[PDB]
Amino acid sequence: MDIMQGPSESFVDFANRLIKAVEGSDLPPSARAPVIIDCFRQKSQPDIQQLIRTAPSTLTTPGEIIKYVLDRQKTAP
Numbered sequence: 001m002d003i004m005q006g007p008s009e010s011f012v013d014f015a016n017r018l019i020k021a022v023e024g025s026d027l028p029p030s031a032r033a034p035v036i037i038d039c040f041r042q043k044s045q046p047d048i049q050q051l052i053r054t055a056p057s058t059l060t061t062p063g064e065i066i067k068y069v070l071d072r073q074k075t076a077p
Helices: 011-023 029-043 046-054 062-072
Strands: none
Touching (some): 029 046, 029 062
């Protein structure tokens, strides 16, 4: 309900509220991921949601999104 990413909130910040929020629910293990998956695309900021929204590759899991988030956040010069 009140799970919304902040203006300048880090990724690990939101996902913790999400994951913890999801774990706290009656959602099954196999369905926990799919929940966070859609949750991001609808609760994440425009900066992240935009990437996930039209992001290629089979991004159907958390293990891929975070990898994808950091993979895109690879601002290492």
